[PDB]
Amino acid sequence: FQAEISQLLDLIINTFYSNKEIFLRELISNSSDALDKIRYAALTDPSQLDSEKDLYIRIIPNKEEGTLTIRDTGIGMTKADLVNNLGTIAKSGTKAFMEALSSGADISMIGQFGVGFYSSYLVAEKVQVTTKHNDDEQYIWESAAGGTFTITEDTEGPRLGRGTSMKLFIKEDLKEYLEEKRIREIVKKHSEFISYPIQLVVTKETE
Numbered sequence: 001f002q003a004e005i006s007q008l009l010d011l012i013i014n015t016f017y018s019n020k021e022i023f024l025r026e027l028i029s030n031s032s033d034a035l036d037k038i039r040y041a042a043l044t045d046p047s048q049l050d051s052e053k054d055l056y057i058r059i060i061p062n063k064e065e066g067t068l069t070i071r072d073t074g075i076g077m078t079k080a081d082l083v084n085n086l087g088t089i090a091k092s093g094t095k096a097f098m099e100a101l102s103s104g105a106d107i108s109m110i111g112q113f114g115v116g117f118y119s120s121y122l123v124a125e126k127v128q129v130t131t132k133h134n135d136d137e138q139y140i141w142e143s144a145a146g147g148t149f150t151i152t153e154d155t156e157g158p159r160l161g162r163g164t165s166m167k168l169f170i171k172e173d174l175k176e177y178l179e180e181k182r183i184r185e186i187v188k189k190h191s192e193f194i195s196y197p198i199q200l201v202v203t204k205e206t207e
């Protein structure tokens, strides 16, 4: 399942999307939807925000690690949610994505096919997904092109409280996406619509 699908999408997405910066639009869009979900659930059950009071998106580059992390305090995913994403959604969305592609239809927005996650492959050679839903444990899953990694209970990672954290291991020739000014421009250009705070961690540079 996952090995073939991730390999296909890695090839197709890198071939047809020359503007690699849209990966950040897709991730921010997914985070925004997850935040809409917990916001709406908290209307009828305020205690849903007990795990994490604030709703936001935070971007954390780590140049020493070569990673760009996008974390949100959205509703998160149960293990069943993540399993469904990896199985049913990935298979069906890949089919719809490449029929749209073949059709010559406007496929600019990848997430309309439910596989926007894989646009991470524009800039990343592997992604570590950490996620925490109020009804389940914290889980981690690793994605790489051709990879068959198992969803695992995360016992040694930092606690999310609630939400989802996408840690992207940036490609060697694309470290520009770790730079503060480049990230800010991309966010400004592609995320005007978002109604949640978008935060960036900037670190004093030696020097």
Ligand SMILES: Cn1nc(-c2ccccc2)cc1Nc1cc(O)cc(O)c1C(=O)N1Cc2cccnc2C1
Binding pocket: 026, 027, 028, 030, 031, 033, 034, 035, 037, 072, 074, 075, 076, 077, 085, 086, 089, 090, 114, 115, 116, 117, 131, 163, 164, 166
């Ligand atoms: C959209 N999506 N797709 C995959 C996927 C993974 C592998 C293979 C195929 C698909 C995973 C996700 N979830 C997320 C991706 C993010 O970047 C940020 C997030 O906060 C989530 C999240 O926790 N959400 C819960 C939720 C509830 C209601 C509406 N939207 C959401 C999104």
